[PDB]
Design an enzyme around this catalytic site. Structure first.
Site, mmCIF file in Angstrom:
data_model
loop_
_atom_site.group_PDB
_atom_site.id
_atom_site.type_symbol
_atom_site.label_atom_id
_atom_site.label_comp_id
_atom_site.label_asym_id
_atom_site.label_seq_id
_atom_site.Cartn_x
_atom_site.Cartn_y
_atom_site.Cartn_z
ATOM 1 N N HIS B 63 0.806 -1.210 0.000
ATOM 2 C CA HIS B 63 0.000 0.000 0.000
ATOM 3 C C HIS B 63 0.845 1.268 0.000
ATOM 4 C CE1 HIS B 63 0.005 -0.265 4.546
ATOM 5 N NE2 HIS B 63 0.001 1.067 4.464
ATOM 6 N N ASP B 205 1.345 -7.697 2.556
ATOM 7 C CA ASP B 205 1.523 -6.275 2.294
ATOM 8 C C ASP B 205 2.968 -5.858 2.183
ATOM 9 O OD1 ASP B 205 0.925 -3.570 1.954
ATOM 10 O OD2 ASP B 205 -0.354 -3.416 3.714
ATOM 11 N N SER B 630 3.741 2.424 8.612
ATOM 12 C CA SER B 630 3.563 1.463 7.524
ATOM 13 C C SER B 630 4.896 1.215 6.824
ATOM 14 C CB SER B 630 2.577 2.013 6.498
ATOM 15 O OG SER B 630 1.235 1.898 6.937
#
Ligand SMILES: O=C(c1ccco1)N1CCN(C(=O)C2CC2)CC1
Ligand SMILES: [Cl-]
Ligand SMILES: [Cl-]
Ligand SMILES: [Cl-]
Lengths: 697, 695
Positions: B63, B205, B630
């Site tokens: 992402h 991810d 992240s």
């Protein structure tokens, strides 16, 4: 697999139960020639289980089992369904019309007797070996001349087991004066409501209290103000020691039905026809219904119960298909029948292989008809409300075609129309449901197989389902109140004979009955072949590790208090607490409202002797016992036979357990007796009920 | 429990060692030498990344690299759906507008900044938090032409602890960062929006990039002559895996926290910010979902808009659950009461006065802040025709030279972007009718944007009629209506246009409210400087971490699951079996990549499966992370890479105000699963070969 054992099988299972933790003597649990714990178990109101918990005939069962009685005594002034009911004296306990409790006084193996009587064969294909009428004639012959008159309160019944390979005679004692003693408010008794149906973890206090009344000598008697509480042969002691993970647990009760001896072809049929059609059709019906309920608050009130009723077997079918897909139910049935076939080939007896072949061939032959039956039943009979609209009887049509009998016929038709188009019926919602249901039905069922009136969708309406449905309501006598009243003022047989709604209803019921009649002959070859199939399985592996299918008779099951992993990285423990009730509280959601007296008990930690060692308040637990419908309200026993809870549900992951027990997923959902006693004590304040029970430390 | 400054490693080291840390202090962070800190990067301004090879290979989330994967995707080579695996360095794709920032040096400059600030004069000056003022101080300290003498390097001063501590960062920025590899979206975004903020999680991810530089390893913009960067430090990859209770640590760039909120600020966050966002988004999403489920074409047009609205809606639900159940308000009240009692004992009333200033400012701005969130959630983001074209001053002073055609072309371009392939006027009218009905019930007539007064004055309270009239009469109500205006345009038509008047009037109210509310930030900021100074003087800096501010921090904890509710336990690790259980071929979110499904069936797990033969996917830890973390590297007790942080569970989102030990977890993709996908799905052996993989 881990089964529902006959009382007769206790002797041969006892050593395994003892090694699994059982401490009580065999005959204290079940003695065929004397008093045992079995005498404290009852069939409550024909479909639930209950248990006697005092020397004055007090009975515990589920709240959902005593629900109708609680509702029948509820008024706007005294709403017992909403607030609970706690009779502070025996004289205040409420009588109930049409209630019963059945004790299993004696159980006898009558296999040799029945099989000898059956030898008087006029037709080898006779179904008398499973006939309730025939078996009742044999039961009456054995019991004696006028047994019911010579033993008031007692009745005799013979049932077939193992597909007709074993027969038992039951001597039953029935009591019909069973009074309501106590019930928690619905907020406790049905805390999860339909959201938590089939769900574990569970936080529902699913219990209600009754009392058996009888005449002066403890003999069954119908309701009379002169009736006195029953002094029973045996009652359960209540344990306050609680449960711990891996503790031995056992249940006695009346499981209704299982399909443990299905062939692999019967599992395929159950999945691809029964379950897939029910899932597909109910998902369409529920989807339209939910959109309408969410758009109009008045539709939500009218259709909430219909929506909830459709969802219950929908969720069961989803759970059952998950087991067929992931737990190898088809494969294990195939392995079971292949093992019998190989053994029969060695024994020189081909009848077992021939029996499995008969079942497969019958299943394959009835596939198209059974698909058409489930399609019409789920799609139209259950799916569309105007399918159950009024159909004028033969006598009603004859009456309307010279006497005052015409006004009698119109009042009868009106009464039925008024019940169809009641305060909960929406013609607009029904038209939207019918348009989606019929579109799917017309896609699945070809023109030549359609109920005659549905042929009009292609022939008269150019395939427009909406136009066909609109026309039924626009022109029908039952399409609106004004349309019915115009018919009722000037009624003619000709108007009813050409009515689009009458023709639809008649057409779909004709097809439904034609399919049922064409399918009925296929049941008998399967039943006869199952008698040979199960006889082989019993002869090969013994009546030791394969239980007879449930048939609403008294059975025992044993296991352990144990949680399970529903999916990757998720574990559900063996016990829920009062904390879990508080976490789920939602005052603006009727299902998850918390009773103020219970909320204050939790805040004050007024748990008394009912809390666990860590000071937490137990609510419910789950166990590896094998239960099914009919086991609601069943007593759950300790290694010492003391009452530790009441079974009230089973998780959706274990519903495939009716065909194949699922050790790693299937659990009985039980309300902890410590929580039952907490609610009676701190919410009901009914000390007299605690005092009459024998509570062990 | 905290997001610690690198400077605070010395003070925390003994606790970290007792919790399981085995590496030497200066091997993790060294203020005057090379350490593991030198392998951590700020990836594209908002994510974290990590250098995992001597040739500048970088790992981050899928992402985080999503926009770059999407920009290189075409109908012929759809890398977003199929993944991308460059089989040679020359095949790695350049990315415009990308950057990676290394934190070369960090210096405490508190005394310097506080001395410079003494020459202010105005006591209420906000220069102590001004990026412009702090940059002038940073330039003064570094030197006049610092970036020319030290190429690729830049300095920056940031305030910490509400202006009580200042740090100068020397940053090395690289802008030639190429796309190397990415799994398909079915792996990179497996749960899609359904599993956002959810634990257990089964999403792989990750995405792979490479830092390029000039011949001497110095930052250089994209050039075909650029060579991969040989970094001074890179992470070793561990294949030993994780076990329950294992020590875990993260380095990264958490963006924001509100650890020093007063109890009144928690009440405001709940009763205004969160309740309005929850109420307004639930109405918007409800109408949108009804429409998407009734029309498959509406589902295609509104899926992204629906998903974008749900993300912060779910965050607000998780945050309000913590305020309701974890006593966030009470713990802030106890924190401030303890400081007030200590100040009363010492004879210093300034801390109690500071908490009072914050409470009085919060109470004074309540009605204005409620009106701001109501219009922002209800109309600015709730109704699409609020962002319909508003003719500029140049456009009106052109329609009434012959550049009338240029004015119409600019208005047309904006109209075409508003009414695009994803815009439904019918869906927007239904959303506006429900949103405005709620808005009109909450905001009184005298506080309404001027055009909304017409609902009562002209339309007799009929919201549907008012909305119908906007579209029926507006030049932006349909294509035919715009074209009729464009053929005969007059400024009189635009000045009386119902949609233009609505859009102008709601944006005027939104700006008026923002301008009235802005002055209330400063008294709170000034009072927080005094409040946090007192908290630090009273209890010290070693339990009280400075709020996140997009600077490098470390956090430590253990690999541990948690109990979300009564009788339910979520373990510390998910497996490939969990991906297969979630497979739904007729649900785009839960589709399973055929190559991965085959790997699971054949059990072709190689050296990546655990000791039981099960293939791990993700794990969770008691580390304290937030947005900005992240792609953060997750380290072993030995500093080896064991995973990448990619999310946090909804139960722990209140952790930005108060860390929740029993619920809050960082959601991490196991590095063994990352290698399994590169190897068995991508077949990119060259990436495995250049990494230093430890047994
Ligand atoms: O009370 C009745 C009724 C019909 C016949 C006897 O009573 N109804 C049914 C139809 N209803 C609706 O459809 C409501 C508008 C939604 C609710 C009122
Ligand atoms: Cl034979
Ligand atoms: Cl199982
Ligand atoms: Cl470097």
């Amino acid at each position: 697999d881990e089964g529902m054992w006959l009382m007769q099988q206790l002797g041969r299972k006892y050593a395994q139960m003892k090694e699994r933790g059982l401490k009580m003597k065999e005959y204290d649990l079940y003695n065929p020639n004397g008093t045992s714990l079995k005498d404290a178990v009852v069939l409550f109101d024909g479909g639930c289980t209950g248990e006697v918990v005092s020397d004055r005939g007090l009975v515990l069962t589920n709240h959902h089992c005593g629900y109708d009685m609680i509702q029948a005594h509820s008024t706007l002034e005294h709403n017992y369904l909403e607030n609970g009911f706690w009779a502070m004296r025996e004289a205040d306990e409420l009588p109930n019309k049409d209630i019963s409790v059945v004790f299993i006084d004696k159980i006898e193996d009558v296999t040799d007797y029945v099989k000898k009587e059956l030898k008087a064969i006029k037709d080898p294909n006779s179904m008398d070996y499973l006939s309730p009428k025939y078996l009742q004639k044999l039961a009456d012959k054995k019991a004696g001349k006028n047994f019911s008159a010579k033993n008031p309160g007692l009745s005799v019944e013979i049932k077939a087991f193992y597909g007709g390979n074993l027969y038992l005679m039951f001597t039953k004692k029935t009591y019909t004066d069973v009074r309501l003693v106590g019930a928690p408010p619905s907020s406790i008794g049905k805390f999860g409501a339909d959201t938590d149906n089939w769900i574990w973890p569970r936080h529902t206090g699913d219990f209600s209290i009754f009392r058996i009344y009888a005449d002066k000598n403890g003999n069954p008697a119908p309701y009379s103000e002169d009736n006195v509480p029953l002094k029973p042969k045996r009652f359960f002691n209540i344990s306050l020691g609680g449960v711990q993970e891996n503790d031995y647990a056992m249940i006695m009760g009346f499981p209704g039905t299982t399909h443990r001896y299905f062939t692999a072809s019967e599992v395929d049929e159950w999945k691809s026809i029964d379950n897939d059609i029910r899932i597909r059709m109910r998902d369409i019906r529920q989807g339209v219904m939910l959109r309408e309920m969410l758009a109009d608050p008045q539709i939500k009130i009218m259709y909430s119960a219909k929506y909830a009723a459709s969802q219950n077997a929908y969720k069961r079918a989803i759970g059952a298909n998950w087991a067929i897909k992931t737990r190898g139910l088809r494969q294990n049935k195939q392995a079971m029948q292949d093992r019998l076939i190989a053994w029969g080939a060695k024994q020189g007896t081909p009848r077992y292989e021939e029996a499995v072949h008969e079942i497969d061939a019958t299943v394959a032959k009835r596939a198209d008809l059974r698909r058409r039956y489930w399609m019409i039943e789920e799609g139209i009979i259950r799916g569309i409300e105007f399918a159950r609209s009024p159909i004028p009887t033969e006598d009603e049509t004859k009456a309307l075609q010279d006497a005052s009998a015409r006004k009698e016929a119109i009042d009868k038709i009106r009464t039925r129309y008024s019940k169809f188009a009641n305060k909960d019926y929406s013609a607009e919602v029904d038209k939207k449901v019918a348009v989606a249901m019929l579109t799917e039905y017309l896609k699945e069922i070809p023109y030549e197989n359609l109920p005659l009136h549905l042929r009009l969708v292609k022939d008269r309406f150019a395939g427009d389902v909406q136009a066909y449905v609109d026309d039924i309501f626009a022109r029908s006598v039952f399409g609106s109140e004004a349309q019915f009243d115009a018919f009722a003022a000037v009624p003619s047989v000709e108007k009813l004979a050409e009515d689009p709604m009458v023709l639809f209803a008649s057409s779909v019921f004709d097809e439904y009955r034609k399919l049922y009649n064409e399918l009925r002959p296929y049941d008998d070859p399967i039943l006869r072949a199952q008698r040979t199939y199960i006889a082989g399985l019993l002869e090969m592996d013994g009546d030791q590790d394969q239980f007879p299918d449930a048939n609403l008779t008294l059975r025992f099951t044993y296991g352990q208090v144990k949680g399970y992993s529903p999916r990757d990285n998720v574990y559900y423990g063996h016990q829920t607490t009062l904390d879990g009730v508080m976490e789920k509280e939602d005052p603006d959601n009727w299902e998850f409202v918390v009773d103020p007296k219970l909320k204050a008990v939790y805040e004050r930690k007024d748990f008394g002797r009912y809390a666990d060692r860590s000071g937490r308040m137990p609510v419910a637990f789950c166990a590896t016992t094998h239960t099914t419908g009919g086991n609601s309200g069943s007593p759950v026993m300790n290694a010492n036979g003391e009452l530790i809870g009441l079974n009230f549900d089973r998780n959706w992951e274990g519903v495939g357990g009716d065909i194949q027990y699922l050790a790693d997923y299937q659990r009985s959902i039980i309300v902890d007796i410590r929580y039952v006693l907490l609610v009676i004590d701190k919410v009901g304040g009914c000390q007299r009920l605690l005092d009459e029970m024998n509570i062990v430390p």
